[PDB]
UniProtKB/Swiss-Prot annotation, chain B:
Phenotype of gene-disrupted mutants: Embryonically lethal. Embryos die at about 10 dpc, due to defects in heart tube development. Cardiac myotubes display enlarged rough endoplasmic reticulum and cytoplasmic vesicles that contain high levels of Ca(2+).
Entry superkingdom: Eukaryota
Function of the molecule: Cytosolic calcium-activated calcium channel that mediates the release of Ca(2+) from the sarcoplasmic reticulum into the cytosol and thereby plays a key role in triggering cardiac muscle contraction. Aberrant channel activation can lead to cardiac arrhythmia. In cardiac myocytes, calcium release is triggered by increased Ca(2+) cytosolic levels due to activation of the L-type calcium channel CACNA1C. The calcium channel activity is modulated by formation of heterotetramers with RYR3. Required for cellular calcium ion homeostasis. Required for embryonic heart development.
Similarity field: Belongs to the ryanodine receptor (TC 1.A.3.1) family. RYR2 subfamily.
Coiled-coil segments on the chain, per record: none
Name of this protein: Ryanodine receptor 2
Domain notes: The calcium release channel activity resides in the C-terminal region while the remaining part of the protein resides in the cytoplasm.
Cellular localisation: Sarcoplasmic reticulum membrane
Post-translational modifications reported in the UniProt record: Channel activity is modulated by phosphorylation. Phosphorylation is increased in failing heart, leading to calcium leaks and increased cytoplasmic Ca(2+) levels.
Organs and tissues of expression: Highly expressed in heart, lung, cerebellum and brain. Detected at lower levels in adrenal gland, stomach, thymus, esophagus and ovary.
Subunit composition and interactions: Homotetramer. Can also form heterotetramers with RYR1 and RYR3. Interacts with CALM and S100A1; these interactions regulate channel activity. Identified in a complex composed of RYR2, FKBP1B, PKA catalytic subunit, PRKAR2A, AKAP6, and the protein phosphatases PP2A and PP1. Interacts directly with FKBP1B, PKA, PP1 and PP2A. Interacts with FKBP1A and FKBP1B; these interactions may stabilize the channel in its closed state and prevent Ca(2+) leaks. Interacts with SELENON. Identified in a complex, composed of FSD2, CMYA5 and RYR2.
Residues of the full protein shown: 1737 to 1784 of 4966
Length: 281, 40, 47
């Protein structure tokens, strides 16, 4: 009955944060389910597509249709292949050869919609509208939190479209390496908040060295960019050299280390170069 | 891990279920000062 | 590889099956937000 009691503004703000955390955990569980079904479905699709490409290759006669299928399977880049295999969102819109997987994916999408908004959300919305109708609210931060929570209840799709770009799947072999990478990234982010000094620059240099030494940086540039600490390194850069732009530049060793890290990040992958181009100005 | 714990549309209590996502390891140094002091 | 394939499928599933649904709730949401409610004072939408 804590929601139903006559709460003051700070208390209701804290429980708004609590409900927001519950929504975040629910979204995380949804992403976990999506990852599981994605694994299974992509395994089936990959084996079936390789089998059908081999079957097409077995054709004795090569013609315009055969070269069309050759471009269909081999020539197209993997992302284009995925988009092509998923073009069947509409009813019978140039679907690929399999259809059992079409039915399975449609069923999964239906149950995902059912799990999303399309009984916690109704309770949260009812409590929020009740509190809003009770009386005029004076705290702008409370009102902002109230309405962002209400909007996230009414639109669960926004969480998916804002979280799937940041989701990633790592192999079970490199779990410890991923954990070490995340720990180093957390240390860098934590040191970003505090004021700058010599001990701080030594810690950042050590963290960046561990980042270089970690093998995950080489293997998964896509995950590297998805975590996106090139932005954090740029933030450290601007923090260090904001005064130095006017005069009296500090931490030459760290600015050199940041330059080397950014150059290496650009050199590992092509898309990382495009990602870093935006800060050219 | 699946989305609905049961064949029914019952969602289940939020925050209760198997979670596999990578998370920072909890560690508290007993009071080098690497971590925060431990608590019961 | 398997991890690359599943990552590509995650991104494709987003851009195809998650970014295209358009459920209409704006009218109902505005109505319930502008409803004065029981007790005047300022409505939630006016707030």
């Amino acid at each position: 009955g804590l929601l139903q009691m006559k709460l003051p503004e700070p208390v209701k703000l804290q429980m708004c944060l609590l409900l927001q955390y519950l929504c975040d955990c629910q979204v995380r569980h949804r992403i976990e389910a999506i990852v599981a079904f994605s694994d299974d479905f992509v395994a089936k699709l990959q084996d079936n597509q390789r089998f059908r490409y081999n079957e097409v290759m077995q054709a004795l006669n090569m013609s315009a249709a055969l070269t069309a299928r050759k471009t269909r399977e081999f020539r197209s880049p993997p992302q284009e292949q995925i988009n092509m295999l998923l073009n069947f969102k509409d009813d019978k819109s140039e679907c690929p050869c399999p259809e059992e997987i079409r039915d399975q994916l449609l069923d999964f999408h239906e149950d995902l919609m059912t799990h999303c908004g399309i009984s916690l959300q109704q309770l949260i919305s009812e409590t929020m509208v009740r509190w809003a109708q009770e009386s005029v609210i004076e705290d702008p931060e409370l009102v902002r939190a109230m309405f962002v929570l209400l909007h996230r209840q009414y639109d669960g799709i926004g969480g998916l479209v804002r979280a799937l770009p940041k989701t990633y799947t790592i192999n079970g072999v490199s779990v410890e390496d991923t954990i070490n990478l995340l720990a180093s990234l957390g240390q860098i982010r934590s040191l970003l908040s505090v004021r700058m000094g010599k001990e701080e620059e030594k810690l950042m240099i050590r963290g960046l060295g561990d980042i270089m030494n970690n093998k995950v940086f080489y293997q998964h540039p896509n995950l590297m960019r998805a975590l996106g600490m090139h932005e954090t390194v740029m933030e450290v850069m601007v923090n260090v050299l904001g005064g130095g732009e006017s005069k009296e530049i500090t931490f030459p060793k760290m600015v050199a280390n940041c330059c080397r890290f950014l150059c290496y990040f650009c050199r590992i992958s092509r898309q990382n170069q495009k990602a870093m181009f935006d800060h050219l100005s | 891990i699946t989305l609905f714990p049961d064949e029914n549309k019952k969602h289940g209590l939020p925050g209760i279920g198997l979670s596999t996502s990578l998370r920072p390891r909890m560690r508290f140094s007993s009071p080098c000062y690497q971590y925060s002091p431990e608590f019961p | 590889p398997r991890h690359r394939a599943v990552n590509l499928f995650l991104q494709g599933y987003e851009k195809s099956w998650i970014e295209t649904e358009e459920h209409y709730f704006e009218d109902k949401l505005i109505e319930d937000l502008a409803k004065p409610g029981a007790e005047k004072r300022v409505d939630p939408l006016h707030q």
